[PDB]
Amino acid sequence: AMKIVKRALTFEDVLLRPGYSEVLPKEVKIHTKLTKNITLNMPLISAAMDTVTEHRAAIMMARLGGLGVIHKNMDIASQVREVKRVKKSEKKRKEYPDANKDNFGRLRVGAAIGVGQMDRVDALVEAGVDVVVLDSAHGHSKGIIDTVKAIKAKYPNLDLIAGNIATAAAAKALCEAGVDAVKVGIGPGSICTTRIVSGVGVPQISAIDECVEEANKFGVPVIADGGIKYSGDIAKALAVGASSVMIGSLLAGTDESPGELFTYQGRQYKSYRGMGSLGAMQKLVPEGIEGRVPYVGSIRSVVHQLLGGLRSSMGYVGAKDIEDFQKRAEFVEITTAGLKESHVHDVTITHEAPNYK
Amino acid sequence: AMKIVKRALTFEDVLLRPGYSEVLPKEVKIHTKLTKNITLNMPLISAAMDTVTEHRAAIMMARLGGLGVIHKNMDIASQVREVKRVKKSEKKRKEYPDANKDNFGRLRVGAAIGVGQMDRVDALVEAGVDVVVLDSAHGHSKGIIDTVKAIKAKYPNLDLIAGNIATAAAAKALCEAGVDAVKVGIGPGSICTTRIVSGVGVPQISAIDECVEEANKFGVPVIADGGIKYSGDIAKALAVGASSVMIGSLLAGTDESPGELFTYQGRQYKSYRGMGSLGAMQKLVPEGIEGRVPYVGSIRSVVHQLLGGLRSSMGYVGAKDIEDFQKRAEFVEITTAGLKESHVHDVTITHEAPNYK
Amino acid sequence: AMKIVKRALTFEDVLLRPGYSEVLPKEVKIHTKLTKNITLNMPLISAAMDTVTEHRAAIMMARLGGLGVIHKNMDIASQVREVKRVKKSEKKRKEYPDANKDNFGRLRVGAAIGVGQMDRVDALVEAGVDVVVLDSAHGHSKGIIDTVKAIKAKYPNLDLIAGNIATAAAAKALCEAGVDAVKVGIGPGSICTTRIVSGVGVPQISAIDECVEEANKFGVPVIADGGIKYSGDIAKALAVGASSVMIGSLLAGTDESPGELFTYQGRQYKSYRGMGSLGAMQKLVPEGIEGRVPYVGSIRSVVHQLLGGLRSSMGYVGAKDIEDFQKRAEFVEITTAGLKESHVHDVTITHEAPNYK
Amino acid sequence: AMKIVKRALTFEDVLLRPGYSEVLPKEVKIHTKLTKNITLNMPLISAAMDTVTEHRAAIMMARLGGLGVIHKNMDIASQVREVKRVKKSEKKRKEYPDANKDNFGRLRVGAAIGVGQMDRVDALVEAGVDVVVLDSAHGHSKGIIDTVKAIKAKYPNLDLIAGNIATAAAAKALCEAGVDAVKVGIGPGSICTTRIVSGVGVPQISAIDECVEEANKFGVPVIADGGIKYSGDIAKALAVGASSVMIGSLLAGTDESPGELFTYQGRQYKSYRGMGSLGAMQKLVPEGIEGRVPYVGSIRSVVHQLLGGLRSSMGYVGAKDIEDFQKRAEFVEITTAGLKESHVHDVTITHEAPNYK
Ligand SMILES: O=c1[nH]cnc2c1ncn2[C@@H]1O[C@H](COP(=O)(O)O)[C@@H](O)[C@H]1O
Numbered sequence A, B, C, D: 001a002m003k004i005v006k007r008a009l010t011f012e013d014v015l016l017r018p019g020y021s022e023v024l025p026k027e028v029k030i031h032t033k034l035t036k037n038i039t040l041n042m043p044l045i046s047a048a049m050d051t052v053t054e055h056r057a058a059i060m061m062a063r064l065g066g067l068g069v070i071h072k073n074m075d076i077a078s079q080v081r082e083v084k085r086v087k088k089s090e091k092k093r094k095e096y097p098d099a100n101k102d103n104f105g106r107l108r109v110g111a112a113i114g115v116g117q118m119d120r121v122d123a124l125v126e127a128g129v130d131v132v133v134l135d136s137a138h139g140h141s142k143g144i145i146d147t148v149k150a151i152k153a154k155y156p157n158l159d160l161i162a163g164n165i166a167t168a169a170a171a172k173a174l175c176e177a178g179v180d181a182v183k184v185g186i187g188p189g190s191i192c193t194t195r196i197v198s199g200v201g202v203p204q205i206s207a208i209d210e211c212v213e214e215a216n217k218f219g220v221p222v223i224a225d226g227g228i229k230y231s232g233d234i235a236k237a238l239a240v241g242a243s244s245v246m247i248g249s250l251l252a253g254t255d256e257s258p259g260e261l262f263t264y265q266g267r268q269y270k271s272y273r274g275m276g277s278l279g280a281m282q283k284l285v286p287e288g289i290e291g292r293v294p295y296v297g298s299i300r301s302v303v304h305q306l307l308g309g310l311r312s313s314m315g316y317v318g319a320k321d322i323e324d325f326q327k328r329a330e331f332v333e334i335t336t337a338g339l340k341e342s343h344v345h346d347v348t349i350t351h352e353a354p355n356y357k
C-alpha cells in the first residue's frame, strides 16, 4: 500500500491565535539570524533570481536591514562585479539606521552558486561576499553534500547556505555536512511548476515546521523560501520556526529589481520568471514559467508594508521579539470557508490598499 | 513542533438541525441581553463605523428594539452631539412598539471609545450614554485592561463593553477586569484584512463558542461582531451562545447610514470602509479596505428580513426564545458540496429576493 | 460548548463502488414502493410545484411508471379538477406498457395539502386521489402531527405522505403518527434558500441515510426530495436507502410542466420558482427564489435519460433490483479533487450531451 | 446505515516527498512491464480511442518505447489493416534507439476488443498483434470473465489485458481468470461522465493503490488508465504502484492522432471524444462527451515532456529505476490551499510553457 506520511499544510491552512499583549507593534524587535554567524536586523531576503536581485536590489535590502542574494545566471566576472558594487556602496547612516553591515561597515551581501562551481566560489570570496548560497532544485543530493564539504574544506570560515529542502532527513544531512543555514522550499514558489511537472513537493508550512525541528538540534537557522503572498505569510513562517524569509514575486515589480518597466493596457508591469523557466535557461523540460508582475514602486515601500504586517502580528501575539514570537505562537487550522471569511468578502473594493492587492 | 490548538470553524462550515416544534416564527420571543444590566428587544447592533452608525442609524436601531453604537472617528463634542440627538429623539409609541428605551423613556444608545480616552468617557457619560464600547483591534491587551479598570473605578455603574477578542483566555481576562460584555471577532469583518496582513485570527463560529463558554462562568454576555453575511448567520451565532450580534456591511447601504447615495453603471451604492482603512485613518499599515455596498433601502426593511430569518430558524429548532434556542441547538458540520447544495444551484435567478442577494 | 452531532455529506461527497455484475442495465428491475400500500414501476416523482406539476405532467409521470403530485397553490375546486383530469385520462396500453395505475386501470395521482386543510382533503378524496402529500417547510411539528392523526381518523385507508424532515427523530415521530411514507429534504432544493435564510438544514445524503434507518423500523418508505442535479444523484439516493426520488428543476423545463416557453438571447427557457418564493406566495420573508431553467423538450426524454443513468448504476453494482441495489451498495467519500476528476475536465465540450449539461 | 468503505484520493490530493538522491534524471531507467510477458522501454500507452490511436500514433508510440492500442470502433478488416501497418512499419534504428519491438524486430502493437468478439480476436492474432486489450465500462463482470477464459483456452500464449476496474475484488477476479495485466480506471477520464451519469467510480490514486496491492499477489502489472493531466500525474501513478499509464487527452491533439486540424478563433484544435459519447456510438444514454483539444504538435514532443517530468520526479526521490521508485515513494496528503500553492500563483503567465498549460 502507498505510504502517506502526513497531511501537510501551507500558509492558507492556518492562522495565529491572539495572545495577551503588553507590547506595541512599533516597540517589538525584528532582528534575527541569517546563519549561525550572520545576523539580520530585518528577517527579509530577496530571491536569487535574474528578475529580482542584482546589486541595487541587494544594496537596498541590506540598507533596510535584510539581505540580497545576487543570482548566478551570469558569468563569474559579472557576479563578482555585482558583489563588489554592494560592498563598495557605503547622509545614509541615519537615512538607513538599521543597515546590515559587516565588521568593516560595508553592506552585507550574498551570492548564489551551483554544484561544483568552485571557481565561482573562489572569485566571490576574494570579492568579499559575506555568504554563499548553494542552491539546487534538490538540496538533498550527493552533488550538494559533496560541494558543501569541498567549500568548507577550502574556506572553513565562509558562511554557507544550502538548499532547497523540504524534509527533516534533508535538514539533518545538510546540517551534518556543516552548513550554516538551510533553505526550505520545494515547489511553493509563485513561478514554480515543480509540483505539477514532477509531482514532488511539500506544502510550505509543514515543510518549515519539519525542517526547523531537525535543524534546531544543530543550532542551524532555517530560511523559508517561496510561497509568500502577503505580509501575514511572513508572520506565519517565522512563528512556525523559520529564522528568515526569502521573497521573489513581491519584490520583482520594484524600481530596484533588474529589467525595465513596460506598459500593457494602461498599466505598468515588470518581468518575473522562474530560474528554471525556458527563458532563464536560455529540448529542455522547464520547472518554472515566464510571467509578469504589477509595478509597485520602491523596495522600501514594499518592505515597510511587509514589516508593518509582521510587527502587527507580533503585537497580536504579545511577542517582544522573534524568539519570543516562536515560543508564544499557537495556531488554528481553518477551512476554505474560514479563508474566505479572512479575506475581504461581500464588499466591492474601490480604493487600492498598500498591503492588500 | 508547531502548536495547532484546534480546527476552527466559521458560519459556512455548519448548519442547525431541525427539531420538534410547537411554536410559530411569529410567536417566538427574540429579546436578549446586551450587557449584564441592559436588555435588548432585538438581538441586533449596528457597528461603530463612520459609514454605518451615527445618530439617525442609532435612533432607528433603538426604535426597532436593538442598539446603535456611535463611532469614535470624530471629535468629542461631535460624538456628544450624536449621543444627545438619540437621547432627545423621543405616533412613535406603537409605530415602534418594541423600542429599546431607558428608565426615562429615552432611546438607548452606545458610543465607542479607545484606550486611554478618559476625557471622551467623561463627556459621553454626562451626555447620558447608556453603554460605552471600548473597542480595539486587540482587546486582550494591557492597554484595554487598564482602561477597563480606570473606567470602572470612576464610573462603577457605567455599562462597559470591551473587545475585540477571539479566545477563552481573553474572555477570562476581560471578565475578571469587570466588563459587562465582551465583543468577539478578530478578522471576520467584511472589510477586514487583519488575518491576511498579520496572519492572526480565529474563524468566527469557533471564536464565539470558545469565548461564550468562558464568559458564561461570569454571567457575561457575548457580542458576535463581524462576518455576518445572511440572516442565517445571525441564527447560527446566537444558537452557538452569543447574546447579540453586531453588523456592519448589511446596514451600510441603508438610508440612515452616514454618507450619500451615488450611481455607478446605472446602480446606486453607498461607501463602506474599514475603520482601519487608509481613508478612515486619514506610511500607515492598514488592516481594512475602502469599498462600496449596494443601496438596499431603509434600515427597517433590512432588519425585518434579518429578524424574519432568525424567527424562522427558532421555529425550525422549536425554540420559544433565545435561551431555549441555545439549549436546543444541535449542529452538523458540512462540506463545500453541502454549502453549494445549501445555496441556490442549477437555476438562473430572474427576480431579486429581499433576503438573498 | 456547541453540540456538533455529525459531519454530514451530500451527493457530491460520495461515489458508488463497482461490484461483480451478471446483469445488464436493460435487464434490471426498477419497480419500488411509493408508500406502504402503493407501488411504482419507476422510482421518480415530480415535485408539487406550480412550475412543475399539474394534470399533464402528472399524466406523463404516471404513464412512464412514476407519479406526479398536483401542487396546492390553487383553489380546492381547481385541484380537484386537475386530479380528475388525471384519473379520467385513460394505443396507450403498450405505447406506455409501464403505466402506474390503480385497481380500476386509472392512472395514479398525488395531491399536496397543508396543515389543517381538512376541507381540501375531503374534496381530493372524493375526487379519487390515490395519495395525499402533507408537506410543510417543517414536517417535524405539532401542526403536521395533528393533521396526520386527523386525516387517519377520518380516512383510515387513505395513503398519506408527510414531510419534509431531515432527522431520525422526525422520522420516528411521523411513523408513530401512522404515515405511509416520509419525505426527506430540508434545504437541498435548487430554488431553496432555507439553509441560508434560517441557517437550518442537513446535507441530503446524510439526511436520507439517517431517516431511512429509522423509517425502516416501521416498514415506511423514504422519499428523497430535492437536490437532484444528475441521474447519478438518483442512483446515490436510492442506493443509500430511499425508496423513491422527488424532482423539481430537472422537470421544470419540459413541455408538460405549467407555464409557457419564452426566448432569451436566442435561447428558450421556462420559469422555475420556489413555492416559498415571493411570486408563488403572491412584508414576507421568502425561503425560495424565482428563476429560469433551459427548455429540455419532453418529460419522456428527460425521464429516459434519468432512468438510463439509474440502470447503468445498478449494472455497475451488479444489482438485479432496487432492494438488491441497496444491499450491495458500498460508497467511498471523495475530495473536491475527486469531484473535479469525476466531471469532464481539461476538454472543451463542443456537442451537447443528453444527460450532461 | 450506508457503508462508506474509505475516503478515496486522486492525483491532486497527494504529492511525493523528496528523498536523498545520487542519480540524475538523465541517468535513471524508465523501462517497465506492460504485461507479465511484455516489457516497455517507456511506461506510456496511447488510449484505444478513435480520436487518439490508429496505425501512425501506434507506430510512434512503439518507436519511442511505449505502445499504442488500436481502437475497436471499426470493422474487423480495418483493425487488421491498422495492426498490419504497424507490424510492417520497420535510419530509424538510432533515430529511435528505444523502439519497442518483438522477437522479429517488428514494432509492438495492441488492439482493443469487446465482450464475445472472438471473430475479431482470431483475425487480430493471425495479423500478429502482440497484445489484446479486452476493455469494458465494467471489467468486473461475467461477460468479461467468460471472454478472458474463452480467449485463454483458444490462445494460451496470447497476452491479454482486461479492464476497466477500480477495486481489489475486481483485480482478484481478473487475475484468477488468468489475465496478463489489469487496466484500472472507472470514471477518471477527461471525457468521461460515468461518475456523474451513474454515480459510480473511484478516485484514481486510491483505485490504483487498491488494485496494485491485490494484483501484486499474482505478479500481474497494473495499467493506470485515465485522469492524467500533467507529467506529475504520471509520476504519482507509477510511484503508487502502477507499471504503466494509458493516456487519451494529452495525445489527442498531436499530428499522429486520427482526425484533421481545424481553426477556431485563430487557434488550431483537434477533435477528442469519449468512446461512450453519442458521436462515437453512432435513445442512447451516453457516458462520455464530444469535445476539442488544442493542437500541440508531434507525439514525440509531448512524450519528451511527459518523460522529462517522470525523470525529474525519480531524480527528486532518488530512484534508479521504476521498481526502486515504487519502493522509495513516500506521499503527503495536501489541501486545496496546498494545490493552489503547487500551481503557478499570483503571477500572470506571459510565455507558453511546453509542459504546463
Ligand atoms: O523556475 C524555478 N523553478 C522552481 N522554483 C524556482 C524557480 N525559480 C525560482 N524558484 C524558487 O522560488 C522562489 C521564489 O518564490 P516566490 O516568493 O513565491 O516568487 C525562489 O527564491 C526560488 O527558491
Ligand SMILES: O=c1[nH]cnc2c1ncn2[C@@H]1O[C@H](COP(=O)(O)O)[C@@H](O)[C@H]1O
Binding pocket: B047, B048, B049, B164, B185, B187, B188, B189, B190, B191, B192, B193, B194, B225, B226, B227, B228, B246, B247, B248, B249, B250, B273, B274, B275, B276, B277, B287, B288, B289
Ligand atoms: O478596518 C478594520 N479592520 C478590521 N476590522 C474592522 C475594521 N473596521 C471595522 N472592523 C470590524 O468589522 C466589523 C464589521 O463586520 P461586517 O458585519 O462583516 O462588515 C466591525 O463591527 C468591526 O468589529
Ligand SMILES: O=c1[nH]cnc2c1ncn2[C@@H]1O[C@H](COP(=O)(O)O)[C@@H](O)[C@H]1O
Binding pocket: C047, C048, C049, C164, C185, C187, C188, C189, C190, C191, C192, C193, C194, C225, C226, C227, C228, C246, C247, C248, C249, C250, C273, C274, C275, C276, C277, C287, C288, C289
Ligand atoms: O420555495 C421553497 N423553499 C424551500 N424548498 C422548496 C421551495 N419550493 C420547493 N421546495 C422543495 O424543493 C424541491 C425541489 O428540489 P429540486 O429538485 O432541487 O428543484 C421540492 O420538491 C420541495 O421539496
Ligand SMILES: O=c1[nH]cnc2c1ncn2[C@@H]1O[C@H](COP(=O)(O)O)[C@@H](O)[C@H]1O
Binding pocket: D047, D048, D049, D164, D185, D187, D188, D189, D190, D191, D192, D193, D194, D225, D226, D227, D228, D246, D247, D248, D249, D250, D273, D274, D275, D276, D277, D287, D288, D289
Ligand atoms: O466515453 C467514455 N466513457 C467513459 N470512459 C471513457 C470513454 N472513452 C474513453 N474512456 C476512458 O478514458 C480514458 C482516457 O482518459 P484521459 O487520459 O483522461 O483522456 C480512456 O483510455 C478510457 O479508459
Ligand SMILES: [Cl-]
Binding pocket: A056
Ligand atoms: Cl546604478
Ligand SMILES: [Cl-]
Binding pocket: B056
Ligand atoms: Cl436628521
Ligand SMILES: [Cl-]
Binding pocket: C056
Ligand atoms: Cl390538455
Ligand SMILES: [Cl-]
Binding pocket: D056
Ligand atoms: Cl500514413
Ligand SMILES: [K+]
Binding pocket: A341, A342, A343, A344, A345, B187, B188, B189, B190, B191, B192, B193, B194
Ligand atoms: K475579513
Ligand SMILES: [K+]
Binding pocket: B341, B342, B343, B344, B345, C187, C188, C189, C190, C191, C192, C193, C194
Ligand atoms: K438550496
Ligand SMILES: [K+]
Binding pocket: C341, C342, C343, C344, C345, D187, D188, D189, D190, D191, D192, D193, D194
Ligand atoms: K471524468
Ligand SMILES: [K+]
Binding pocket: A187, A188, A189, A190, A191, A192, A193, A194, D341, D342, D343, D344, D345
Ligand atoms: K508553485
